Each structure stands twice: as C-alpha cells, then as structure tokens.
From a paper:
Signal regulatory protein α (SIRPα) is an immunoinhibitory receptor expressed primarily by cells of the myeloid lineage including monocytes, macrophages, DCs, and neutrophils. Upon interaction with its principal ligand, CD47, SIRPα transmits inhibitory signals that regulate DC homeostasis, self-recognition, and macrophage-mediated programmed cell removal. During malignant transformation, many human tumors exploit upregulation of CD47 thus activation of SIRPα signaling to avoid phagocytic clearance, resulting in the suppression of myeloid-mediated innate immunity and poor induction of antigen-specific immunity. Here, we report the development of humanized AB21 (hAB21), a pan-allelic anti-SIRPα antibody that binds human, cynomolgus monkey, and mouse SIRPα alleles with high affinity and blocks the interaction with CD47.
The anti-SIRPα blocking antibody clone AB21 was discovered from immunized SynVH chickens, which contain human VH immunoglobulin (Ig) repertoires paired with the natural chicken light chain repertoires. Since clone AB21 contained the chicken light chain sequences, we carried out humanization as described in the Materials and Methods to derive the humanized version, named hAB21. Humanized AB21 (hAB21) retains the SIRPα binding and antagonistic properties of the parental AB21. The structure of a Fab version of the antibody in complex with the IgV domain of human SIRPα v1 was solved by X-ray crystallography. The hAB21 Fab binds to SIRPα at an epitope highly overlapping with that of CD47, with the VL domain overlapping with the majority of the CD47 binding site while the VH domain CDR-H3 inserts into the central pocket of SIRPα that is crucial for CD47 binding, in agreement with the ability of hAB21 to completely block and antagonize the CD47–SIRPα interaction. The chimeric antibody AB21 binds to human SIRPα v1 and v2 alleles with picomolar affinity, potently blocks the interaction between CD47 and SIRPα, and cross-reacts with cynomolgus and murine SIRPα. Two allelic variants of SIRPα, v1 and v2, are present in the human population at various frequencies and zygosities dependent on ethnicity.
Author numbering:
A (entry chain S): 3 to 117
B (entry chain L): 3 to 214
Write the structure that this text describes.
C-alpha cells in the first residue's frame, strides 16, 4: 500500500527567502493527483494542485511531467510570517463525482523568522 | 491492449455507448478522441470523465473495472466518425489506444444505389490501358456486391473504394474500377457491372457496348 512521506517535521526560514516543503510517494498506483494544503481541517487552504490551477509563488522541486517522477516537493518563494503553519502533502485517488483523499504525509510545520 | 467494437449504430436523437476493455480502473487514466478520415483527432474526454469547454454537453465518459465508456446523448448525423479510446497505463508508462469504433447512424431507411457506368477514355487508350468504372451513388446501408462481366465473370482485375457515411444524408457511395489491357478491351464487346443491394428487389445490371 502506497505511502506519502514528508521527511521534515519542521522547517525554519527567514522572511523573503524560499521555503522547501518535501514530499515523496512510494508508488504512482493507484492513480490520482497530489495536492498540498495548509491545515488538515475543513477550512484547509489549497497551496498546490497537480491537476489544474495557477500557483505563481510555488515551484516544484522535480519535473512533474517526468512519467517516472515520485517527488512532489515544492518551494514557496519570498516567504512572509503570513505563510507560517502546518503543510500537508496529500494523495487523492480517482472517484466518480469527485476524487477522494487516500493518503497524507504527517505534516511539516513551517516557521518564519521575521525581517 | 485496449479492445473496442469495430462498429456501433444508433438512430438520430438516441443514446449510444462505446466501451473499451483491457484496462484497470486503479492503474489507468482514459481519454476519448474523435476522427473523421486521416485527419487530426479531437479530444472529447480526458481523465475518464472531464470535457473540454469546446466539446458539446452530449458527450460524456466514465470508467470502472477493466472498462472505459464514451456516451453520446442525442446522436446527430454529424457525429458519424471513428471514436478512439486512449489510455495512460501508469504501471508501464505507456499509452495504448483501441482500434477505434465507427459510429454508423441508422437515420436512413434502405436507399437503393443509383448505378452509373463509364467506359475508358480514348485518351487513356493511347497510353495502353483501359480503365472501366462503375459508380454506386447515395445508398444505405454500406453492404453491396459489385460483379463485373465481359459476359464472363472477371475476378481479381477490379478494386473498390467507399466514402464514409455522409455527414448530412447518411448515405455511402462506392466506385469499382475494372483494369484491362487495350488488347483485352478491344477483343471483347459487352461491358457490365451487376449491383446487388438490399434496397434493390433484384440485381441491377448496367452495360455499354465498346464501339457505341
């Protein structure tokens, strides 16, 4: 059974720098997109979506167009204290009306040192 | 490998289903592609069930078990085409396609072919070959039998071509060319194609005589 690994429990970064949030998957089956969120509640905030959408602050560490790719780590540029919080890497499987959440990493606590 | 039926048929306004087998719901994404002849395919459905904005609401897709299905809800005569299923198989990093399914619309009742005959041109005859052409115009359904006769049944000197179902009237048209030497053309007299079709009670022969 597929695992989503967030290797880093916490990340400390200076304001204005690039934060690297790491995530790998042990398999690409079952099929379905990876997404990043801040928070794990119902009010959680979408940070990156493999399927669709524009996320200009977000760069991917690896080439996600590589058929082979299993690295879903992201970089968030010009970080501010407003960016701090817990970030979760999430695998969805295909589902009929909607895709459904399948596996999650254990989270990454992003801390920002001001100024 | 992905497998789909060679053909499917539907009355206009009705709902048609076309399914590919040989995939696996958990290790594939599927798409559907429409092609008229030897022209660029058009993507109808991607990620199993998603429709690009430019594609009519009557096309939908689904998938489960070993199967993927394109549904067309309100078949129109202009949907006459070949429909390909295309998978991405995540287990092997490959992109299998089915052989394609032609959608035949029934719209039409039987329509007998108009049959026409054309003898070789004098122009062609100088060049040292005689081509004889039998035209079957604006008939339905596809199946037809053309036999050539120099009063004797000639075989293996003829080749046929068919249009695709016409986008407006849902007819086919068929040509058969008989190819002979002029030597051969000049020693015989009666040229005829005999056309057998469901819309014809009995066969229609059409003929010329060489000199006339």
């Amino acid at each position: 059974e597929l695992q989503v690994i967030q290797p880093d429990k916490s990340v400390l970064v200076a304001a204005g720098e690039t934060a690297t949030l790491r995530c790998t998957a042990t398999s690409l089956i079952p099929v379905g997109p990876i997404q990043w969120f801040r928070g794990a509640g119902p009010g959680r905030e979408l940070i990156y979506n493999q399927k669709e959408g524009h996320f200009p602050r977000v760069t991917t560490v690896s080439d996600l167009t590589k058929r082979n790719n299993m690295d879903f780590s992201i970089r968030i540029g010009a970080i501010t204290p407003a960016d701090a919080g817990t970030y979760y890497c999430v695998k969805f499987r295909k589902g009929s009306p909607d895709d459904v959440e399948f596996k999650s990493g254990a989270g990454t606590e992003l801390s920002v040192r001001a100024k | 490998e992905l497998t789909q039926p060679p053909s499917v048929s539907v009355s206009p306004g009705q709902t048609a289903r076309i399914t590919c087998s040989g995939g696996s719901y958990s290790s594939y994404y599927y798409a559907w592609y429409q092609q008229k002849p030897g022209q660029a395919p058009v993507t109808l459905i991607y990620s199993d069930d998603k429709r690009p904005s430019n594609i009519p609401e009557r096309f939908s897709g689904s998938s489960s078990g070993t199967t993927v299905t394109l549904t067309i809800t309100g078949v129109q005569a202009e949907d006459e085409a070949d429909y390909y299923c295309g998978g991405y198989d995540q287990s092997s990093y490959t992109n299998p396609f089915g052989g394609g399914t032609k959608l035949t619309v029934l719209g039409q009742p039987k329509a007998a072919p108009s049959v026409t005959l054309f003898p070789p041109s004098s122009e062609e005859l100088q060049a040292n070959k005689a081509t004889l052409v039998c035209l079957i115009s604006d008939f339905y359904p596809g199946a037809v039998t053309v036999a050539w006769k120099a009063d004797s049944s000639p075989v293996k000197a003829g080749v046929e071509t068919t249009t695709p179902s016409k986008q407006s009237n849902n007819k086919y048209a068929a040509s058969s060319y008989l190819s002979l030497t002029p030597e051969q053309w000049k020693s015989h007299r009666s040229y005829s194609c005999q056309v057998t079709h469901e819309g014809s009670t009995v066969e229609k022969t059409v003929a010329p005589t060489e000199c006339s």
